[PDB]
């Protein structure tokens, strides 16, 4: 698993792979690692496949009650808190899940909150969770700039997941992209890692030690 | 008669016990809330009638709930102290579960929530309090002012008053407070709050409490002199015409 | 006929809580008790009501009690109702000390108690406390403090207060002679100089009293709390106006 | 473990607390603030187990603040640390205990004296002139035993504390990504954003 | 790891002609790391003294538990609790927690304001009581103390000689114990007047 | 004279008066009107404020339950806030369990199974709350199975579906008028001027966009609460046709 998200002038950029594996066999290459909490918030999926999916979908319902009551958009901080709180209650029981809650409200701007089953709740600009997190961090650390265009901000996230995909055996498939804005998120497709590689190698020169 | 319990409807669809609770709010002293467009001002009156007692720790009728919200009441004194406490705790629990500090409506709602909870089952008696909650939501600049009744209902106002002789003070306010254009100065917004109580205070600024609340958790009580500096300037134009 | 005074859970058409008012009425049947503030101390004076020739009274007490090592109270009203409170009032006082490892502030303790009395006024199946209290104590927050609380659950701070029988008289006399700075040995003076005037008995006999005071200064950087003995009384009583 | 230092001087307390946050193999952050102000003149740093750490901190903070508006009076360093040790004390014997160690350093406007209390997850509290949690002590305690004096200026303390960090860097295996310093005194709390901006 | 040896420390009590003495070291440390040298293990409620060893967090809690308790006693009986009436307490107290004990080793010691007779007593974690006319020891250097007390003790010492005997026992065991030291303090309790003293010892 | 004091007491002719009085509590509310059209559903209400210092929007007489369901109440307000709250939770939960929208009547259903929880004594189960709610509901919504539906919830515990209905002080004359106006081929704009017209009629005060609130719901945009300018001109545009015929 290789999931990541980051802040910048354009807002937030979320990118994930889609490989799920049982032992050494690839049980599936079609996983939606991005939980569409609601029109304005996205959660990623690391740790436990179900725990992430289940509670985050739960969380969405929570935001909905909150918005009907206050007649106002819930804030990324309050949402991320709700989640981590519920998670903390089950500390010990054996849950499992590293995650990025991403939103962009009017008052707080674009915000990413990393949250996991330990009860940790971190605010940040760049986050990478996964078995390929180390590789993603590479491409990302060296190229990130707050003033990235939107077009390039997406390409960066894409190339990053790709780097993981290649080296980390437990990562691969197809990258999925999203861009989060003050009006909500926009899906930017699903690109097969198979095809994307050859493309990049060819149009970027990188990946020399690969004959093809 | 049908006014004996909270769980019984009169033939015409009333519930008098709750209604009578309100008759007690009228007994208490007068409170008045007045909002501007950059502030909110609460005012009260002091039951200065039987004193040979202390002074130091004398209630101001106005209490802070959070750094950005104050509340004032009228009616059963002892009853009021519990609502103020309960709302204070909740105000801190909200920060604990959502990071964000409470909104003025969320608080008002929580309070009235309690007041209504005490008119549900029998073997319980409705709080004999009516309250005015004023303040500013987090990182927001629109002044807010709400009122709650013993029955459990809450409402927002441009200015409002409760307690004995609240009918009078209300008349006054109505023909003075301009809906289209609220007091644009904390000083005049005060002036207006003062002159209104100056129809039930029975002379002297020794019977008037004023508290001012602005944005950014900035709240501040008023002193006896400052308050008189207005009784002064309004006692001028009074016979000046 | 038909009245709205059958219980605490019921508002009269005018928002009155009679049952509570009647309890507030049970106080005027208690022995007079006084509390007077001073520039350097606080005085508690009471007048045993109950009487009979063969009634032990040199050992046990009935109106003055120590709640904290820095706080004292004068009782007036239902004997049993008084102990129930006094005890919890003592437990709470110790939890504060056990949690903050500091002594509990007066107003906090008075408020906690008034808050329990408040509660027995709003829930069915409960009867309000037929007690009144004069709290006299000292904390580093507001120096010496004199507080009072009734059955309705309200409390307040006086400079000199009286509760019990003939409160009108006792209250009046004080309102008159109390000098705002008055030293302690003048308050203990004014204590009797009021209790006397508002008694009945052919004569005010020592065995019919209870005094206690709270003093402190530079010396003991802390507070000394004294509960006068039958002796000291029978004595300081003569030093004034009794043969 | 994380780094938690603290030292009381002439008229104030200073708190040092490493900035990094690490989850297994990577470092998700190198600008974390392990502090959390309980009131205008009481500050409390912490370090411990992943989730337990700030859930607890905030909880404590909420209680103090509640008490403060209610009483309208500010609870004292001594009484504040007492409350903390009470909670943690009950914690150790509960279904699951918080594993959090702390430092509380406030200014007692009543005595006009700075005070620093060090408490560990077991409920063990002690008042000290300077302290540290975890392994942090072995590398510093000797330097402070050597130079510390109660008459020290705030200005002198920092210089001292700088030395301790320099030592922590030279001999400690972990790379704590620097520290963030904060000062508590008669005027409240402020951040020495110049030990970082240096 | 034994919970009763993380923090360390020692306490000893003795009886003499119309007096008692109670003494302890000052160190509180975590394992090998020494943390403090101002950590006192001896408290008192009225004219009754109690020294406690073991797990520091429990030592503190117990003091608070007994202060709390004794204040309520005094208030209710209109008199301070006595040494025996107190021992019985801390014993029951310790026991109500028989299946999750506080990890300590208390030691009461005082003079009875009625009889006027000296008293010293010890207990183990679950509350088993133990009176003795000569001495009580408890702590990490528990054995070193039994060795010192079973030599230097002498029935009916004068308070001035008791101070010398008790000090020497404490002083020397703390030197053969790796987790006890950093100073000491000794009390000499008479019917009236109580004298407290700190001693000078190796700081290693 | 004697059987109307217990919510669990049958009168000799099998009646539960306390429940009946309950309803009589609603008549005191101000009027609420709902008209259903194959184009969408409309909800309008008389606000009726005691003072000019009140903030209008402070009086939530029309609210959203979910993006596809809204409603207007009449009767005791505190009692309403509680139903509105339950209703909202009901909707959201169902969504969570089924990944779909709750049928309007199945929602209305859960709202009634709530009022059904009155009664104190202990003859078996347990439903804590002494008496009937003092309020009714006009629930306007829309779902893929039965289209635009409009319901009337009563504290009795039952409900009917309507084509148009009015509740509150004026439901007497209002219901008469609606009986002689409504017809299946009404356009949305047509019903708006009709709800608006009947209020003005059996209302009272000069009908201004301050004492009258108007809303509607459609498949396209869900529940929307008409802003003041719109309603304002809808009133002018209305009051005008009155001149000629």
Report whether C162 contacts C194 (CB < 8 A): yes
Q: Give the separation between CA D89 and CA C99, rounded to whole angstroms.
A: 11
- Structural domains in chain F (count): 1
- CA A51 to CA A57: how far, in whole Å? 10
Helix/strand/coil for B45: strand
Residues F78, B19 contacting (CB under 8 angstroms): no
Q: Taking CB atoms and an 8 Å cutoff, what residues of chain F touch B119?
A: 78
- Cβ contact A70–B99 (<8 Å): no
Q: Residue D54 and residue D32: Cα distance in Å, rounded?
A: 12
Phi, psi (rounded to 5 degrees) for D26? -100, 175
Q: Report how far apart, in Å, the C-alpha atoms of E105 and of each of B170, E108, E131 are.
A: 72, 10, 14
Max Cα–Cα distance, chain A, nearest Å = 60
3 state DSSP class of F105: helix
Residues C61, C33: Cα–Cα separation, whole Å: 14
Q: For chain C, how many structural domains are there in total?
A: 1
Q: What angle do CA E122, E124, E126 make, to 5 degrees?
A: 130
List beta partners, residue A129: A3
Tell me the three-class secondary structure of A129-164, residue by residue. Answer: EECCHHHHHHHHHHHCCCCCCHHHHHHHHHHHHHHH
- For C222-226, the CB contacts below 8 A with 24+ separation are C223/C70, C223/C138, C225/C66, C225/C69, C225/C70, C225/C72
Q: How many CB atoms lie within 10 A of CB E155?
A: 9
Residue to substitute from F131, F133, F167, F210, interface B, most B β-carbons within 10 A? F131
Does B64 contact D at CB distance below 8 Å?
yes
In sequence order, what are the residues at sequence separation of 6 or more whose Cβ sits closer than 8 angstroms to the Cβ of residue B27? B75, B164, C15
CA triplet A111, A114, A116: central angle to 5 degrees? 150
- Would you say E68 and C94 are in contact if contact means Cβ atoms under 8 Å apart? yes
Residues in F whose CB is inside 8 Å of some CB of A read 64, 66, 88-89, 92-93, 95-96
Angstrom CA distances, B140 to A110, D118, E122, stand at 18, 39, 65
- Does A77 contact B at CB distance below 8 Å? yes
Angle in degrees, CA F15, F17, F20, rounded to 5: 110
Would you give the end-to-end CA distance of chain F in angstroms? 51
Q: For chain F, what is the total number of helices (H) and then of strands (E)?
A: 6, 10
**Contact (Cβ atoms closer than 8 angstroms) between residue A121 and residue A114:** yes
- What is chain E written as a DSSP string? --GGGSS--EEEEEEETTEEEEEEE--EEETTEEEES----EEEETTEEEE--B-HHHHHHHHHHHHHHHHHHHHHHTSPPPHHHHHHHHHHHHHTTTTS---B--EEEEE-TTT--EEEEEE-TT--EEE-SSEEEEETTHHHHHHHHHHH--TT--HHHHHHHHHHHHHHHTTT-TT--S-EEEEEE-SS-EEEEEE-----
Q: Which domain holds residue A117?
A: 1-212
Query: What gap in Å lies between CA F108 and CA F151, rounded to an integer?
Result: 7
CB spacing of E71 vs C66 below 8 angstroms: no
CA distance E146 to E169: 9
Domain range holding B41?
Answer: 1-241
Give the C-alpha separation, E144 to F216, whole Å: 89
d(CA D124, CA D116): 14
Interface test with C, best of D86, D87, D106 (most C CBs within 10 A): D86
CA distance F97 to F93: 6
Q: In what order do the strands lie in the sheet with E10-16?
A: E135-139, E10-16, E19-25, E184-189, E194-199
CATH number, domain of E46, equals 3.60.20.10
Beta strand C71-77 pairing with C64-68:
antiparallel
Residues D183 and D195: beta-carbon distance below 8 Å? no
C-alpha C216/C-alpha C227 separation (Å) is: 15
Q: What distance in Å separates the CA atoms of residue A130 and residue A4, rounded to the nearest whole number?
A: 9
Terminal-to-terminal C-alpha distance of chain B: 54
> C and B: touch, per 3+ CB pairs < 8 A?
yes
Q: What is the CATH classification number for the domain harbouring A202?
A: 3.60.20.10
Across chain C, where does the E strand assignment appear? 33-37, 41-46, 64-68, 71-77, 131-139, 143-149, 155-157, 160-163, 210-216, 223-227
Domain that holds residue C13: 1-243
Chain B, chain F: beta-carbon pairs less than 8 Å apart: 77
Q: Does B204 touch chain C (CB under 8 A)?
A: no
Q: Which residue of E has its CA nearest to C91?
A: E72
CA–CA distance, E185 with E41 (Å, rounded to integer): 9
Chains that touch A (3 or more CB pairs under 8 A): B, D, F
Residues 6+ apart with CB under 8 A from E125: E4, E54, E94, E101, E102, E103, E104, E105
Question: CA B219 to CA B68: how far, in whole Å?
Answer: 7
CA distance B201 to B203: 6
A1 as an active site residue: the answer is yes
CA dist C172 and C196 (Å) reads 14
Q: Supply angle C-alpha D17, D19, D22, rounded to 5.
A: 120
Provide CB contacts within 8 A for A27, sequence distance 6+. A20, A21
Ramachandran angles phi, psi of C52, nearest 5°: 180, 155
Whether D82 has its CB under 8 Å from any CB of chain C: the answer is yes
* Nearest residue in chain B measured CA to CA from A78: B98
Q: How many structural domains does chain E have?
A: 1
- DSSP code string of A58-72: HHHHHHHHHHHHHTS
What are the residue ranges of helices labelled H in F14-131? 17-24, 77-98, 104-115
Residue C167 contacts residue C77 (beta carbons within 8 Å): no
CA-based nearest distance F207→chain B, Å: 19
Report helix, strand or coil for C116. helix
User: Cβ contacts of residue B135 below 8 Å, gap of 6+?
Assistant: B40, B65, B66, B68, B69, B70, B104, B107, B144, B213
Considering its fold, how many domains does chain D have in total? 1
* 3-class DSSP state of B186: helix
Is the torsion defined by CA of C74, C79, C84, C85 positive or negative? negative
Phi first, then psi: what are they for D162, rounded to 5°?
-65, -40
| Residue of A63, A68, A70 to mutate when probing chain B, most B C-beta within 10 A | A70
Closest-approach residue (CA) in chain A for B138: A107
Q: Which residues contact C66 (CB under 8 A, 6 or more apart)?
A: C72, C225, C227, E75
Q: Which helix (H) or strand (E) holds C238?
A: helix C238-241
Please give the Cα distance from C173 to F145 (Å, whole number): 84
What whole-number distance in Å separates Cα of residue F75 and Cα of residue E179?
76
What are the phi and psi torsion angles at D71 (to 5°)?
Answer: -85, -20
| Count of domains observed in chain B | 1
What is the sign, positive or negative, of the torsion defined by CA atoms of A190, A194, A200, A202? negative
Q: Are A197 and A158 in contact (CB under 8 A)?
A: no
Chain D residues in contact with A91 by the CB 8 A cut-off are: 51, 96
For residue C105, how many other CB atoms are within 10 A of its CB? 23
Q: Is B13 on the interface with C (CB under 8 A)?
A: no
Helix %, strand %, coil % of chain A (to 5): 35, 35, 30
Closest CA to F149 of F163, F165, F167: F163
Is the separation of the CB atoms in A10 and A20 below 8 Å?
no
C-alpha to C-alpha distance for A147 and D50, rounded to whole angstroms: 33
Name the DSSP letter for residue B53.
B
Q: How far is CA E2 from CA E31, E55, E58, E140, F211, in A?
A: 11, 10, 14, 11, 77
CB F95 within 8 A of CB F169: no
For residue F39, give the CATH number of its domain. Answer: 3.60.20.10
**CATH at B44:** 3.60.20.10
Query: Do C101 and E72 make contact, defined as CB atoms within 8 angstroms?
Result: no
């Amino acid at each position: 698993t290789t999931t990541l998200a980051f802040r910048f002038q354009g807002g937030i950029i979320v990118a994930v792979d889609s490989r799920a594996t049982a032992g050494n066999w690839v049980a599936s290459q079609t996983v939606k690692r991005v939980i569409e909490i609601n029109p304005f918030l996205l959660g990623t999926m690391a740790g436990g496949a179900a725990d992430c999916q289940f509670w985050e979908t739960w969380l969405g319902s929570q935001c909905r009650l909150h918005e009907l009551r206050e007649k106002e958009r819930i804030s990324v901080a309050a949402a991320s808190k709700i989640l981590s709180n519920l998670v903390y209650q089950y500390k010990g029981a054996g849950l499992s899940m590293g995650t990025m809650i991403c939103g962009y409200t009017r008052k707080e701007g674009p915000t990413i909150y990393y949250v996991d089953s330990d009860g940790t709740r971190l605010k940040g600009d760049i986050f990478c969770v996964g078995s390929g997190q180390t590789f993603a961090y590479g491409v990302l650390d060296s190229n990130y700039k707050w003033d990235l265009s939107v077009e390039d901000a997406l390409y960066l996230g894409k190339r990053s997941i790709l780097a993981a995909a290649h080296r980390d055996a437990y990562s691969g498939g197809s990258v999925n992209l999203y861009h989060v804005t003050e009006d909500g998120w926009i899906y930017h497709g699903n690109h097969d890692v198979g095809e994307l590689f050859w493309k990049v190698k060819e149009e970027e020169g990188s990946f020399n030690n690969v004959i093809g | 008669g049908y006014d004996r319990a909270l769980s019984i409807f009169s033939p015409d669809g009333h519930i008098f016990q709750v209604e009578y609770a309100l008759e007690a709010v009228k007994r208490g002293t007068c409170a008045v809330g007045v909002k501007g467009k950059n502030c909110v001002v609460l005012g009260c009156e002091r039951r200065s009638t039987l004193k040979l007692q202390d002074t130091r720790i004398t209630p101001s009728k106005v209490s802070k709930i959070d750094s950005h919200v104050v509340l004032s009441f009228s009616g059963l004194n002892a009853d009021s102290r519990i609502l103020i406490e309960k709302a204070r705790v909740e105000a801190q629990s909200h920060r604990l579960t959502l990071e964000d500090p409470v909104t003025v409506e969320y608080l008002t709602r929580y309070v009235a929530g309690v007041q209504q909870r005490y008119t549900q089952s029998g073997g319980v008696r409705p709080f004999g309090v009516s309250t005015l909650i004023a303040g500013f939501d987090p990182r927001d600049d629109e002044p807010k002012l709400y009122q709650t009744e013993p029955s459990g209902i809450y409402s927002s106002w441009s200015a409002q008053t409760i307690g004995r002789n609240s009918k009078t003070v209300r008349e006054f306010l109505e023909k003075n407070y301009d809906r289209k254009e609220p007091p644009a100065t904390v000083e005049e917004c005060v002036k207006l709050t003062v002159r209104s109580l100056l129809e039930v205070v029975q002379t002297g600024a020794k019977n008037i409490e004023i508290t001012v609340v602005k944005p950014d958790s900035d709240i501040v009580a008023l002193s006896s002199e400052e308050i008189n500096q207005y009784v002064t300037q309004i006692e001028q134009e009074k016979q000046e015409q | 006929s038909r009245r709205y005074d059958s219980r605490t859970t019921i508002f009269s058409p005018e928002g009155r809580l009679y049952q509570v008012e009647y309890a507030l009425e049970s106080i005027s049947h208690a022995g007079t008790a006084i509390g007077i503030m001073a520039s350097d101390g606080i005085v508690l004076a009471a007048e045993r009501k109950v009487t009979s020739t063969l009634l032990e009274q040199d050992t046990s007490t009935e109106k003055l009690y120590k709640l904290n090592d820095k706080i004292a109270v004068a009782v007036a009203g239902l004997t049993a109702d008084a102990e129930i409170l006094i005890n919890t009032a003592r437990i709470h006082a110790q939890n504060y000390l056990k949690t903050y490892n500091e002594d509990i502030p007066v107003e906090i303790l008075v408020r906690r108690l008034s808050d329990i009395k408040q509660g027995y006024t709003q829930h069915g199946g409960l009867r309000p406390f037929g007690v009144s209290f004069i709290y006299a104590g000292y904390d580093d927050r507001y120096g010496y403090q004199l507080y009072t609380s009734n059955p309705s659950g309200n409390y307040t701070g006086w400079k000199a207060i009286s509760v019990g029988a003939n409160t009108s008289a006792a209250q009046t006399l004080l309102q008159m002679d109390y000098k705002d700075d008055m030293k302690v040995d003048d308050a203990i003076e004014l204590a009797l100089k009021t209790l006397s005037k508002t008694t009945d008995s052919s004569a005010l006999t020592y065995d019919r009293l209870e005094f206690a005071t709270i003093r402190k200064g530079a010396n003991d950087g802390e507070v000394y709390q004294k509960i006068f003995k039958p002796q000291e009384i029978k004595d300081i009583l003569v030093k004034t106006g009794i043969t | 473990m994380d780094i938690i230092l603290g030292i009381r001087v002439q008229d104030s307390v200073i708190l040092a607390s490493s900035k990094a946050v690490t989850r297994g193999i990577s470092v998700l952050k190198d600008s974390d603030d392990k502090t959390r102000q309980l009131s205008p003149h009481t500050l409390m740093s912490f370090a411990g187990e992943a989730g337990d750490t700030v859930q607890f901190a905030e909880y404590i903070q909420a209680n103090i603040q509640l008490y403060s508006i209610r009483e309208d009076y500010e609870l004292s360093p001594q009484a504040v640390s007492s409350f903390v040790r009470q909670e943690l004390a009950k914690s150790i014997r509960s279904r699951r205990p918080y594993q959090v160690n702390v430092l509380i350093g406030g200014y007692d406007k009543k005595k006009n004296k700075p005070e620093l209390y060090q408490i560990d997850y077991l409920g063990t509290k002690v008042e000290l002139p300077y302290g540290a949690h975890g392994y942090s002590g072995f590398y510093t305690f000797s330097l402070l035993d050597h130079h510390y004096r109660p008459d020290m200026t705030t200005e002198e303390g920092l210089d001292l504390l700088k030395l301790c960090v320099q030592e922590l860097e030279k001999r400690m295996p972990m790379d704590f990504k620097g520290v963030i310093v904060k000062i508590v005194d008669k005027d409240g709390i402020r951040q020495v954003d110049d030990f970082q901006a240096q | 790891s034994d919970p009763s040896s993380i923090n360390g420390g020692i306490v000893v009590a003795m009886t003499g002609k119309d007096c008692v003495a109670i003494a302890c070291d000052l160190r509180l440390g975590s394992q090998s790391l020494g943390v403090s040298n101002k950590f006192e293990k001896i408290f008192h409620y009225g004219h009754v003294f109690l020294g406690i060893t073991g797990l520091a967090t429990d030592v503190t809690t117990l003091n608070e538990m007994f202060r709390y308790k004794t204040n309520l006693y005094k208030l209710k009986e209109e008199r301070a609790i006595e040494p025996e009436t107190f021992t019985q307490l801390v014993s029951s107290s310790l026991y109500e927690r028989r299946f999750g004990p506080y990890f300590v080793g208390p030691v009461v010691a005082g003079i009875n304001s009625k009889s006027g007779k000296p008293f010293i007593a010890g207990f183990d974690l679950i509350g088993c009581i133990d009176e003795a006319k000569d001495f009580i020891v408890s702590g990490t250097a528990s054995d070193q103390l039994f060795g010192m007390c079973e030599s230097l003790y002498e029935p009916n010492l004068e308070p001035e000689d008791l101070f010398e005997t008790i000090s020497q026992a404490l002083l020397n065991a703390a030197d053969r114990d790796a987790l006890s030291g950093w100073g000491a303090v000794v009390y000499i309790i008479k019917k009236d007047e109580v004298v407290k003293r700190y001693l000078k010892m190796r700081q290693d | 004279s004697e059987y109307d004091r217990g919510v669990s007491t049958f009168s000799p002719e099998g009646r539960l008066f306390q429940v009946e009085y309950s309803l009589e509590a609603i008549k005191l509310g101000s009027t609420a009107i709902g008209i259903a059209t194959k184009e969408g559903v409309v909800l309008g209400v008389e606000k009726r404020a005691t003072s000019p210092l009140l903030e209008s929007d402070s009086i939530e007489k029309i609210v959203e339950i979910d993006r596809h369901i809204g409603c207007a109440m009449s009767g005791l307000t505190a009692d309403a806030r509680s139903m509105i709250e339950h209703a909202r939770t009901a909707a959201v939960t169902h969504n969570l369990y089924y990944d779909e929208d709750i049928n309007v009547e199945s929602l209305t259903q859960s709202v009634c199974d709530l009022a059904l929880r009155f009664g104190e004594g202990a003859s078996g189960e347990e439903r804590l709350m002494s008496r009937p709610f003092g309020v009714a509901l006009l629930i306007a919504g829309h779902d893929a199975d039965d289209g635009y539906q409009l319901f009337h919830a009563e504290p009795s515990g039952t409900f009917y579906r309507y084509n148009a209905k009015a509740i509150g002080s004026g439901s007497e004359g209002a219901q008469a008028e609606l009986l002689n106006e409504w017809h299946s081929s009404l356009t949305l704009k047509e019903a708006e001027l009709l709800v608006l017209k009947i209020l003005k009629q059996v209302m009272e005060e000069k009908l201004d966009e301050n004492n009258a609130q108007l809303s509607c719901i459609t498949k396209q945009d869900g529940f929307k609460i008409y802003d003041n300018e719109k309603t304002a001109e809808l009133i002018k545009e209305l009051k005008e046709k009155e001149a000629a015929e």
